[PDB]
Amino acid sequence: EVEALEKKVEALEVKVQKLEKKVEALEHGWDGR
Amino acid sequence: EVEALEKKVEALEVKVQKLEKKVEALEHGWDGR
Amino acid sequence: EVEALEKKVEALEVKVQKLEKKVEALEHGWDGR
To answer: At CB < 8 Å, which residues of chain B contact A?
Structure first.
């Protein structure tokens, strides 16, 4: 259970980092995004 | 503790999926968003 | 392990709340964002 939760949490960290990059690109208009 | 963490992690998955949909809509301009 | 996971989950909640605010601002154009 705990190890599986560690994996789901890391997966969420990956998804959140991607969202952060995409949101910063939209907020700042980077490269015309 | 562990079961409560499982619930919080699932709640985060729900919030992250919603954010992903909203961000993709903004990035692609779907339906004028 | 479990307490460390509790901390990572709270950190994710903070990041997700920030993303939600930023996305709502972009979706609604708040304050010209």
So the answer is: 2, 5-6, 9, 12-13, 16, 19-20, 23, 26-27
